[PDB]
Design an enzyme around this catalytic site. Sequence first.
Site, PDB file in Angstrom:
ATOM      1  N   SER A 195      74.385  80.899 -12.329  1.00  0.00           N
ATOM      2  CA  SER A 195      74.000  81.366 -10.994  1.00  0.00           C
ATOM      3  C   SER A 195      73.259  80.247 -10.269  1.00  0.00           C
ATOM      4  O   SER A 195      73.860  79.174 -10.078  1.00  0.00           O
ATOM      5  CB  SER A 195      73.238  82.679 -11.154  1.00  0.00           C
ATOM      6  OG  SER A 195      73.218  83.333  -9.921  1.00  0.00           O
ATOM      7  N   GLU A 322      81.326  89.878 -10.682  1.00  0.00           N
ATOM      8  CA  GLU A 322      80.119  89.192 -10.212  1.00  0.00           C
ATOM      9  C   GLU A 322      79.321  90.024  -9.209  1.00  0.00           C
ATOM     10  O   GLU A 322      78.083  89.980  -9.198  1.00  0.00           O
ATOM     11  CB  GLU A 322      80.480  87.854  -9.551  1.00  0.00           C
ATOM     12  CG  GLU A 322      81.092  86.818 -10.438  1.00  0.00           C
ATOM     13  CD  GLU A 322      80.082  86.195 -11.359  1.00  0.00           C
ATOM     14  OE1 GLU A 322      78.897  86.596 -11.329  1.00  0.00           O
ATOM     15  OE2 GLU A 322      80.472  85.300 -12.122  1.00  0.00           O
ATOM     16  N   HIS A 435      77.523  90.061 -13.360  1.00  0.00           N
ATOM     17  CA  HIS A 435      76.813  88.799 -13.186  1.00  0.00           C
ATOM     18  C   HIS A 435      75.712  88.633 -14.225  1.00  0.00           C
ATOM     19  O   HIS A 435      74.830  89.489 -14.356  1.00  0.00           O
ATOM     20  CB  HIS A 435      76.222  88.786 -11.772  1.00  0.00           C
ATOM     21  CG  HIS A 435      75.569  87.497 -11.375  1.00  0.00           C
ATOM     22  ND1 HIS A 435      76.282  86.346 -11.123  1.00  0.00           N
ATOM     23  CD2 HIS A 435      74.275  87.200 -11.115  1.00  0.00           C
ATOM     24  CE1 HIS A 435      75.453  85.388 -10.751  1.00  0.00           C
ATOM     25  NE2 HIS A 435      74.228  85.880 -10.735  1.00  0.00           N
TER      26      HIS A 435
HETATM   27  C1  LIG Z   1      70.769  92.663 -12.912  1.00  0.00           C
HETATM   28  C2  LIG Z   1      70.059  91.942 -12.283  1.00  0.00           C
HETATM   29  C3  LIG Z   1      69.174  91.010 -11.437  1.00  0.00           C
HETATM   30  N1  LIG Z   1      69.268  91.342 -10.305  1.00  0.00           N
HETATM   31  C4  LIG Z   1      70.400  91.067  -9.830  1.00  0.00           C
HETATM   32  C5  LIG Z   1      70.128  90.959  -8.296  1.00  0.00           C
HETATM   33  C6  LIG Z   1      68.667  91.016  -8.124  1.00  0.00           C
HETATM   34  C7  LIG Z   1      68.278  90.036  -7.001  1.00  0.00           C
HETATM   35  N2  LIG Z   1      66.993  89.354  -7.151  1.00  0.00           N
HETATM   36  C8  LIG Z   1      65.878  89.798  -6.295  1.00  0.00           C
HETATM   37  C9  LIG Z   1      65.525  91.276  -6.484  1.00  0.00           C
HETATM   38  C10 LIG Z   1      65.000  91.909  -5.183  1.00  0.00           C
HETATM   39  O1  LIG Z   1      65.847  91.540  -4.121  1.00  0.00           O
HETATM   40  C11 LIG Z   1      67.050  92.262  -4.047  1.00  0.00           C
HETATM   41  S1  LIG Z   1      67.018  87.689  -7.531  1.00  0.00           S
HETATM   42  O2  LIG Z   1      67.166  87.435  -8.967  1.00  0.00           O
HETATM   43  O3  LIG Z   1      65.731  87.048  -7.248  1.00  0.00           O
HETATM   44  C12 LIG Z   1      68.319  86.833  -6.606  1.00  0.00           C
HETATM   45  C13 LIG Z   1      68.182  86.598  -5.243  1.00  0.00           C
HETATM   46  C14 LIG Z   1      69.185  85.938  -4.554  1.00  0.00           C
HETATM   47  C15 LIG Z   1      70.340  85.510  -5.259  1.00  0.00           C
HETATM   48  C16 LIG Z   1      71.379  84.836  -4.550  1.00  0.00           C
HETATM   49  C17 LIG Z   1      72.508  84.430  -5.237  1.00  0.00           C
HETATM   50  C18 LIG Z   1      72.644  84.649  -6.614  1.00  0.00           C
HETATM   51  C19 LIG Z   1      71.645  85.317  -7.308  1.00  0.00           C
HETATM   52  C20 LIG Z   1      70.475  85.744  -6.591  1.00  0.00           C
HETATM   53  C21 LIG Z   1      69.444  86.414  -7.294  1.00  0.00           C
HETATM   54  C22 LIG Z   1      68.189  90.715  -9.319  1.00  0.00           C
END
Ligand SMILES: C#CCN1CC[C@H](CN(CCCOC)S(=O)(=O)c2ccc3ccccc3c2)C1
Length: 526
Positions: A195, A322, A435
């Site tokens: 990622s 994904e 993912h």
């Molecule tokens: C299962 C599982 C993990 N969850 C998958 C989604 C979640 C996103 N998260 C932030 C959480 C709060 O906000 C939505 S993250 O890990 O910080 C994040 C933020 C932006 C991204 C952009 C592109 C690729 C990956 C990214 C990851 C976390």
Amino acid sequence: IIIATKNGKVRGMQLTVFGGTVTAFLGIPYAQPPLGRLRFKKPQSLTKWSDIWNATKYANSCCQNIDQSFPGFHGSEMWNPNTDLSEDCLYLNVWIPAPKPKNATVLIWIYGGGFQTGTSSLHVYDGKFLARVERVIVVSMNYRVGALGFLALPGNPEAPGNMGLFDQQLALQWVQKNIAAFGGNPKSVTLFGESAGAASVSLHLLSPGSHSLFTRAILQSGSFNAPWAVTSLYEARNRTLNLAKLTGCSRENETEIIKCLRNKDPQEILLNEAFVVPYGTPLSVNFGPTVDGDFLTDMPDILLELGQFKKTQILVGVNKDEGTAFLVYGAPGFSKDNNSIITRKEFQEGLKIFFPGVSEFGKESILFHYTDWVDDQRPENYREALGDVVGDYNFICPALEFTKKFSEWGNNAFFYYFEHRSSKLPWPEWMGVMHGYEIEFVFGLPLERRDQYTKAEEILSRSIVKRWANFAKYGNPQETQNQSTSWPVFKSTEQKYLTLNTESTRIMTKLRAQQCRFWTSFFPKV
Ligand SMILES: C#CCN1CC[C@H](CN(CCCOC)S(=O)(=O)c2ccc3ccccc3c2)C1
Ligand SMILES: *[C@@H]1O[C@H](CO[C@@H]2O[C@@H](C)[C@@H](O)[C@@H](O)[C@@H]2O)[C@@H](O[C@@H]2O[C@H](CO)[C@@H](O)[C@H](O)[C@H]2NC(C)=O)[C@H](O)[C@H]1NC(C)=O
Ligand SMILES: *[C@@H]1O[C@H](CO[C@@H]2O[C@@H](C)[C@@H](O)[C@@H](O)[C@@H]2O)[C@@H](O[C@@H]2O[C@H](CO)[C@@H](O)[C@H](O)[C@H]2NC(C)=O)[C@H](O)[C@H]1NC(C)=O
Ligand SMILES: *[C@@H]1O[C@H](CO[C@@H]2O[C@@H](C)[C@@H](O)[C@@H](O)[C@@H]2O)[C@@H](O)[C@H](O)[C@H]1NC(C)=O
Ligand SMILES: *[C@@H]1O[C@H](CO[C@@H]2O[C@@H](C)[C@@H](O)[C@@H](O)[C@@H]2O)[C@@H](O)[C@H](O)[C@H]1NC(C)=O
Ligand SMILES: *[C@@H]1O[C@H](CO[C@@H]2O[C@@H](C)[C@@H](O)[C@@H](O)[C@@H]2O)[C@@H](O)[C@H](O)[C@H]1NC(C)=O
Ligand SMILES: *[C@@H]1O[C@H](CO)[C@@H](O)[C@H](O)[C@H]1NC(C)=O
Ligand SMILES: [Cl-]
């Protein structure tokens, strides 16, 4: 148990793994703690110690916001940090086979987490199985994320941007200067990451300061040309200023803004990260890599297109589903606790969630290309279409476009399509091959029989670990002994890829051909 590095002696610890022994050095420092006046600056080199640093436990994870969306649920909490958060987090880990190898190939892991989260101490990143089974050395490092890692006032060295990328880089330098003392070969170093870690890996292929710090590269579910991966200078500065306003740090002297932000508690900074954009998405990367003129000398799309990158072999791949993980973080009608059958109207609302700044015509164009059905009456049609929209746009089509563009300059490239759903996956069935859930197979967790994976999954992890090891050591991800499918190179004409599953491993061509022509050629115009 005691290794002499160029900054002092470090003590490790013996781990018993599969009836053998692995030596782990957990939490070796590799930079000055970026504290006080050093917050937001590039990482500074480390001062010699004369005692024996006890590298016997994971160090602090970098400051970061935690996923609180599903308290008590292993599917989300397995990604949250499992050590104390601190700004004092620039540390790395080394797993060496025992007996100490002679000239071992080195694997360097770079975790993902959207450049806002992540830590190298996670259970699914435990490098002891790879050191035991393939006799490679596995290194992983903590690097700064969020604003503390990627705040940008371009050209201003108080906050130049890309600091988390320079954290990764200083660690690679540490491996160049010290890993021979551990039995590793500094001339045989493979970066791998998933990622944002994979996007990080691809950016090291473009950075001239990283050229001579590694040999080969592995990109799992990510690349710098993904739409979330690189922030523009205008966005980056508008976001720095919005953070300043949100913290009472607005000044006219930009250096005074940074000094003001240096007296804020990390928690003040973290709390306001989410609001520097006017409209966010579950894929928002509020503070990420920018074109700083240092780590990144030009827009990476131009560098890729014009062949300005390290010439070497790459292994790139993606997971079959994904996109599904992000639907339960805001898309209406979705839930990990039911089958998430959504309607056409909920699908349209979901596009507003994932494409907020996009014109009505842009959003209709996604709908048009993803809702021509093989069957108007299948009730999961819109649920699955939204998953594929998010997966193709954000991960699959960028990874494929990266691999085409990279391979056109002469280098061997190998593409995989991981389509096995872990039997231990805590998320529901409709989310498929999510993912991040190839990672436990890469790190060899199913090789542990005590851990409730099936036999077919042990075999699949064993073949994956061998292909990854052979790619790192020899530039060629074959499994040569067990009459396995030969993995052909990905060429821009034929675009062959290998599927990874427990049943039949297959050579296919032109993954998502129809979908990626939409995302790669039409959608960027809107
Ligand atoms: C299962 C599982 C993990 N969850 C998958 C989604 C979640 C996103 N998260 C932030 C959480 C709060 O906000 C939505 S993250 O890990 O910080 C994040 C933020 C932006 C991204 C952009 C592109 C690729 C990956 C990214 C990851 C976390
Ligand atoms: C550049 O940033 C401005 C300012 O953002 C506002 O203030 C921040 C501190 C934070 O609280 C943000 O959420 C605020 O939105 C953005 O201007 C806003 O734009 C939205 C919609 O675009 C509008 O409804 C608000 O009224 C605007 N606020 C102001 C003060 O102008 C602006 O959109 C940003 N530029 C880009 C390209 O995203
Ligand atoms: C699947 O669940 C979603 C989420 O709803 C929540 O979680 C459920 C498991 C259950 O505990 C619900 O009561 C919770 O609200 C459902 O979407 C919600 O549907 C309601 C209907 O009143 C609607 O008003 C809400 O806005 C929806 N919430 C969200 C976040 O979209 C959905 O309908 C369920 N689908 C199926 C097929 O059962
Ligand atoms: C660093 O570790 C030193 C030795 O630790 C002890 O001895 C070794 C052989 C192992 O059995 C280990 O588990 C023991 O704890 C300590 O003497 C020294 O104080 C430590 N330094 C610190 C904690 O700063
Ligand atoms: C360790 O091995 C070195 C050569 O490494 C090999 O060649 C480079 C160019 C890479 O392709 C790498 O993958 C290969 O394994 C030797 O030059 C060096 O002297 C060796 N040193 C020791 C101490 O064993
Ligand atoms: C390769 O397979 C090993 C065991 O497989 C069995 O024995 C071999 C000789 C063949 O007869 C095969 O069909 C049998 O099922 C595993 O122990 C070993 O780990 C495998 N290696 C890799 C790299 O996947
Ligand atoms: C901002 O202040 C710094 C010293 O703190 C100074 O070097 C810089 O020139 C100032 N810029 C202004 C006042 O525009
Ligand atoms: Cl088209």
